[PDB]
């Protein structure tokens, strides 16, 4: 519902959404999604799991 949505918002009226009570297993994105930019700031990616 976040990554594979239908219409996104405009940058002047950008959208915000809360996430709670869920398991963050992102390897389910490997089969479909291919990101051009991914950057994490206060955390290393090898520790997100």
């Amino acid at each position: 519902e976040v990554f594979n949505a239908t219409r996104f918002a405009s940058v002047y009226a950008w959208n915000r959404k809360r996430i709670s009570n869920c398991v963050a297993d992102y390897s389910v994105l490997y089969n479909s999604a291919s990101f051009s930019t991914f950057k994490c700031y206060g955390v290393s990616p090898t520790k997100l799991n």
Partner: protein, 48 residues
């Protein structure tokens, strides 16, 4: 102006958006299951 000791060349083909994954950290599909570099890496990466 240097001389190098134990030179190995590794070769493969990937997709463009995955090139940023050829680096010491960089979790992802290519780095988790296919090809991984160490943290104490001395060498060079080239892509075209």
């Amino acid at each position: 102006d240097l001389c190098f000791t134990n030179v190995y060349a590794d070769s493969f083909v990937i997709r463009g958006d995955e090139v940023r994954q050829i680096a010491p950290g960089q979790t992802g599909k290519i780095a988790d299951y296919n090809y991984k570099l160490p943290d104490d890496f001395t060498g060079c990466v080239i892509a075209w």
